Design a protein around this ligand. Structure first.
Ligand SMILES: [Fe+3]
Length: 650
């Protein structure tokens, strides 16, 4: 059967689920999804039912999405409700801390201030901010209200126990837990800030825009960012306490039935969603409000399949809620490097013991997996080609240090000297060799420039065929690759045409043009590479294509390159930027210019790890022209990590 067992948490919900069930049968054909209805006592019982394979799907708030993820439940987000409208779907809100312009303090200076909260137990106004501040609170941290009462000098915390903790009600005596209290709710807590009762209001990104129509007034307010800087109120995407999904359908991590759940809900919205005007409506009920889904919902969006709960909720949210649940606080130290192979891990392990605890190791199977571990705190750092820096950046990470070899390396187009027809001005129908799709030298620069000439990124229809590792297996740009079985066209070492050397090899054996870096040909000719494919080559037999339309010798790269590559760079989270900057310079003065295979963790061209100063953003580090190019190449991107991050921040 293709049945989705929907979990209801009340009798009114099960009634709506049964109506849902019955109406779907009229509009979905026999080979299509159907609905079964399971009634449990609570959200938590539903989570357990689904983990136990007694049900399949339930829609949850953020907090319960977190509970659902924890062992032994192991559920994940699969479909999101959206709001507002189809043109600009709203899936998330942002919890923010709003303050007055010129009030003279940062997030790490909130102790002693006056706070305005929407209400005790509410997410944006209490659980998140207090969650994030948890370890700043004085001991004993239980009971929580007492500890908060002794952190802020006074507050309005609606619904708090002012009798036992009067500080929490200084700004709203009684701590009224209703609209009768002028400082209750989102508009209430903002008002508490605006009227000068408090110094900080813990509310939503939209709260200020709903209460202040004129920009001139909003310019008198700012937001506290967790890096202890301030930003304008319309920049909440880069300055929030947490990003929070409004309502999320979850399901088993393995065994599903993700695709069935989406097929069901997508067809349900199409026949019974917003403004469909049938007797049955998905987003309302005669039996009650917010049954199964929120009545305000306008539809559903499929959650990208790479997404897990921690990535969906985000690192900020998870930190906040972890603190609340676990109640654990520390008493700088170990940087967790991410390895991508057994040989990367072996160098890392012996680095760890050589560093004396200062460095530790974690491994993942691909770069993206390693990036995701950095985003969620399972790891802290790794070094990346410019193309992965962009992806890391879109995913919220920052570059901290750049690999130096000597402005960085040159991306060049290599060709065989014999075939003296080839020029940059027309490579249409020729055979191309790339390091990998999405890398600086192999793709982003050359195809970036190419995009401007042809105005599309279907490069498998420009070149006759090629090898560009990471392409779709049925693409003409996997035809020249050499990997066997499942390894064919894979962006890793089991594919011999992957990477700088690989792409040059590809040119030598099969291609017409290879997109690599300036030192690749010199290093793989003249006997320096002893492998049979390179041993007997000399660099004089290869030439570079210049932007002119002319050609030049390989040593002449400085006047015959496509563009300057931004260097490979170490990336991490903003909250570890300082510690990573410190520990690596302290480690490279000990183990720098003063791997057992090739280019493990860092390139072997790397002489030092260099300061970035003001270029600690992916946009500022890569430069605008590089970012523009990659932007245009996304239209044809197949990176599932990038798809997941962009779902959360388009
Ligand atoms: Fe590179």
């Amino acid at each position: 059967d293709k049945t989705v067992r929907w979990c209801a948490v009340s009798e009114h919900e099960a009634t709506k689920c049964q109506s849902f069930r019955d109406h779907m049968k009229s509009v979905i054909p026999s080979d299509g999804p159907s609905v079964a209805c399971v009634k449990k006592a609570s959200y938590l019982d539903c989570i357990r039912a689904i983990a136990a394979n007694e049900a399949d799907a339930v829609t949850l708030d953020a907090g319960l999405v977190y509970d659902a993820y924890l062992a032994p439940n192991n559920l994940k987000p699969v479909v999101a409700e959206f709001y507002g409208s189809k043109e600009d779907p709203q899936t998330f809100y942002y919890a923010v801390a709003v303050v007055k312009k010129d009030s003279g303090f940062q997030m790490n200076q909130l102790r002693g201030k006056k706070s305005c909260h929407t209400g005790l137990g509410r997410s944006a106004g209490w659980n998140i901010p207090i969650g994030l501040l948890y370890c700043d609170l004085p001991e004993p941290r239980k009971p929580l209200e007492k500890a908060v009462a002794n952190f802020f000098s006074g507050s309005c915390a609606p619904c708090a126990d002012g009798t036992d903790f009067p500080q929490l009600c200084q700004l709203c005596p009684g701590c009224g837990c209703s609209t009768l209290n002028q400082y209750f709710g989102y508009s209430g807590a903002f008002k508490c800030l605006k009227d000068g009762a408090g110094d900080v209001a813990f509310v939503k990104h939209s709260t200020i825009f709903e209460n202040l129509a004129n920009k001139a007034d909003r310019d008198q307010y700012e937001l506290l960012c967790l890096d202890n800087t301030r930003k304008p109120v319309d920049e909440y995407k880069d300055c929030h306490l947490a990003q929070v999904p409004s309502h999320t359908v979850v399901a088993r991590s393995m065994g599903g039935k993700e695709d069935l759940i989406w097929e069901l809900l997508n067809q349900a919205q199409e026949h019974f969603g917003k403004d469909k005007s049938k007797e049955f409506q998905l987003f309302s009920s005669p039996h009650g409000k917010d049954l199964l889904f929120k009545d305000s919902a306008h539809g559903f969006l499929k959650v990208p399949p790479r997404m897990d709960a921690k990535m969906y909720l985000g690192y900020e949210y998870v930190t906040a809620i972890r603190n609340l649940r676990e109640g654990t606080c520390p008493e700088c130290k170990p940087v967790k490097w991410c390895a991508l192979s057994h040989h990367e891990r072996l160098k890392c392990d012996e680095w760890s013991v050589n560093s004396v605890g200062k460095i530790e190791c974690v491994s993942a199977e691909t770069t993206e997996d390693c990036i995701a571990k950095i985003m969620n705190g399972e790891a802290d750092a790794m070094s990346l080609d410019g193309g992965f820096v962009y992806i890391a950046g879109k995913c919220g990470l920052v570059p901290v240090l750049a690999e130096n070899y000597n402005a960085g390396y040159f991306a060049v187009a290599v060709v065989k000297k014999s075939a003296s027809d080839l020029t940059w001005d027309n490579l249409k129908g020729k055979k191309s060799c790339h390091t990998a799709v999405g890398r600086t030298a192999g793709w982003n620069i050359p195809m970036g420039l190419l995009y401007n000439k042809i105005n599309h990124c279907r490069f498998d229809e420009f070149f006759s065929e090629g090898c560009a590792p990471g392409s779709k297996k049925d693409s003409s740009l996997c035809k020249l690759c050499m990997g066997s079985g499942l390894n064919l066209c894979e962006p890793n070492n089991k594919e011999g045409y992957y990477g700088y050397t690989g792409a040059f090899r590809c040119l030598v054996e099969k291609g017409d043009v290879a997109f690599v870096k300036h030192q690749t040909v010199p290093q793989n000719t003249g006997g320096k590479n002893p492998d049979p494919w390179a041993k007997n080559l000399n660099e004089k037999d290869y030439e570079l294509l210049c932007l002119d339309g002319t050609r030049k010798p390989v040593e002449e790269y400085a006047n015959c390159h496509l563009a300057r590559a931004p260097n490979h760079a170490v990336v991490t989270r903003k909250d570890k930027e300082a510690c990573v900057h410190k520990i690596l310079r302290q480690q490279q003065h000990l183990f720098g210019s003063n791997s057992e295979t090739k280019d493990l963790l860092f390139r072997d061209d790397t002489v030092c790890l260099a300061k970035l100063h003001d270029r600690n953003t992916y946009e500022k580090y890569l430069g605008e022209e590089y970012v523009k190019a990659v932007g245009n190449l996304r239209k044809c991107s197949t990176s599932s990590l990038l798809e997941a991050c962009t779902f959360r921040r388009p």
